Amino acid sequence: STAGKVIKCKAAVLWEEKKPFSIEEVEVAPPKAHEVRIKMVATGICRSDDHVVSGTLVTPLPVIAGHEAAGIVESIGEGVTTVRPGDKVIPLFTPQCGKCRVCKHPEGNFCLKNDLSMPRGTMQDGTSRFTCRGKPIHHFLGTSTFSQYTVVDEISVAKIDAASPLEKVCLIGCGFSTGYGSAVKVAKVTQGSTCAVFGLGGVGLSVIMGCKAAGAARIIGVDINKDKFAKAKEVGATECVNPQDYKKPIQEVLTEMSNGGVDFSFEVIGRLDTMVTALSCCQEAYGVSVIVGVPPDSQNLSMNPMLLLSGRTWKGAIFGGFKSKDSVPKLVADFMAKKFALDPLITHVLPFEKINEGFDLLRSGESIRTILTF
C-alpha cells in the first residue's frame, strides 16, 4: 500500500547541537537496490544518541538519530535477499558486508563499510532517503531509528524471530549486545575472576550480566550515582563502590579490594580520566581493561606506558565485538530461550512523541533504558 511511494511520517529531527529534538513531518523515499524500508516498532534511548545532541559524538547535522531499535520490513529494493516485507528486523549500526578484510577476519567486527570512523551521515551510495522542510536530512550510523519509518542498506539489517517481542529485543540493537559481548567476547572473562565495571547504565549492567554468565567470582560496580547500585546488584554485582565516598583515588581502592588489582576492568562511561583509572585498577602483570565508553570527539588522553610494559592488556570494541548480522538473530534466539534478561535494563516506556522527556530521564540520572513505542 506504501510500497514504491514516498512515505510522509513523523520523525525526531535534530537541527542543531544542544537543542531538543523537533518532532515533525519528514518524507521517506522508497528503498533503492539492496535497501530496506522499516516501520519502526520500538527504539531505545542510548547515551550515544545524547552524545550527538551534546557534540561529544560528531556526525553531520541536521540528522535523524537513533540506532537501538526493532521494526517490521515495509518494503525491499531490487536485489534484497536476506529480508522480506513483514519480517521483524533489527537495524545494525555496525554493518556486516561479509566481503571486507575485517568481516572475513575471525576476530574483527568493525566492517569497513561502517559510518562511524569518518561519518558522512548517508546511505552507502552517499545520498539521503530523508527530506524535511524541503531539505535533505542526514542518516545516523546507517540506521536512523528516531522516525516512524527508516531506510537502511541490506548490510545494516538482520532478520529476527517472527515471534520476538520488539519492545524488548530492540536493546539487542545496541546496549545489551555491546555490554554483554564486551565481557564474554572481547575481555573473555574467566570462571572465578574478579571484574570492575565503571558506569552502571544500560551498557554497564549488560557488562555485569556478561561477567556473571562467564562465571566471574566478584563483580565490582563503580558509579558516582549510588542510585544505580541496587539494579547492578540484582544483575550480578557482588559489591558497588562510589568514588566520592573515598579519600584515595578509586584505582587504589579497587587494587586493595582485589589484593593487587582486578582480572578484568571495563570503562562504560566515556571519560578520558576513567579510561586511565580503569586500566590502572587491573592487575599490572596479567590484567585486561576494555574501553566501551565513547569519549569527547578529537580529545587525547595522557598515560604512562609503564602501565602496559608490566603486562597489562588494553583494548576497546564497538558493539561488544559481535559480527552484527551473524550475531543479532542468535542473540534474539537466546533471549527467546531466556538465556539472558532484558527487563532489568528497561525502567521507562514512553510513546515516540515524548522523546524529549526520554532524554530528560536519561540526563537526570533517573532512567537506565527508556523504550519509545511508535
Ligand X SMILES: OCC(F)(F)C(F)(F)C(F)(F)F
Residue ranges of the annotated binding site are 46, 48, 67, 97, 100, 103, 111, 174, 199-204, 223, 228, 292-294, 319, 369
Q: Which of 91, 119, 199, 287 binds ligand NAI (CB under 6 A)?
A: 199
Residue 156 burial by Cβ neighbours in a 10 Å radius (0-12, 13-18, 19+): buried
State how far the Cα of 278 lies from the Cα of 105, in Å rounded to an integer.
28
Q: Is 147 a catalytic residue?
A: no
Q: What is the residue-wise DSSP string for 45-88? A: --HHHHHHHHTSS---SSB----SEEEEEEEE-TT--S--TT-E
**Residue appearing with cell numbers 545520498:** 127
The 60-89 site mask, x for binding its own copies (CB under 8 A), equals: ------------------------------
Residue from 103, 174, 195, 288 touching ligand X (CB under 6 A): that is: 174
Binding track over 47-86 against ligand NAI, x by CB under 6 A:
xx--x-----------------------------------
Residue nearest to ligand NAI (CB): 201
DSSP for 102-164, written as a single string: TTTSTT----TT-SSSS---S-TTS--SEEETTEEEB-STTT--SBSEEEEEGGGEEEE-TT-
Distance between CA 302 and CA 332 in Å, rounded? 40
| Least gap, CB of 58 to its own copies (angstroms) | 11
ω into 62 cis (within 30 of 0): yes
The minimum distance between CB 311 and its own copies, in angstroms, equals 5
Nearer to ligand NAI, 175 or 261 (CB): 175
Residue 255 corresponds to which cell in the numbers above?
587494587
Which one of the spans 163-171, 172-180, 241-249, 312-320 is the region binding Zn ion (CB under 5 A)? Answer: 172-180
> Any catalytic annotation for residue 138?
no
Using CA of residue 310, residue 316, residue 320, residue 324, what is the dihedral sign? negative
Q: With binding defined as CB under 6 A, does residue 372 bind ligand NAI?
A: no
Counting contacts by CB under 8 A, is residue 304 touching its own copies? yes
Angle at 246 between CA 242 and CA 251, to 5 degrees: 75
As a whole number of angstroms, the distance between CA 313 and CA 341 comes to 30
Question: What residue 358 binds from Zn ion, ligand NAI, ligand X, none (CB within 5 to 8 A, per partner kind)?
Answer: none
Say if residues 41 and 89 touch (Cβ distance below 8 Å).
Answer: no
- Closest to Zn ion by CB, 48 vs 150, is 48
User: Does 204 help bind ligand NAI (rule: CB under 6 A)?
Assistant: yes
Choose from its own copies, ligand X, ligand NAI, none: what does 269 bind? Cβ within 5-8 Å by kind. ligand NAI
- The amino acid present at 65, given as its one-letter code, is A
Q: Which of 34, 51, 138, 139 is catalytic?
A: 51
Which residue is catalytic, options 34, 46, 170, 211?
A: 46
List beta partners, residue 75: 37
User: Residues marked as binding for an alcohol?
Assistant: 48, 67
Note whether 318 binds ligand X by CB under 6 A.
yes
Residue 68: Cβ within 10 Å count: 28
Binding site for Zn ion (CB under 5 A): 46, 48, 97, 100, 103, 111, 174
**Which residues of the shown chain bind ligand X in the complex (CB under 6 A)?**
46, 48, 57, 67, 93, 116, 141, 174, 294, 318
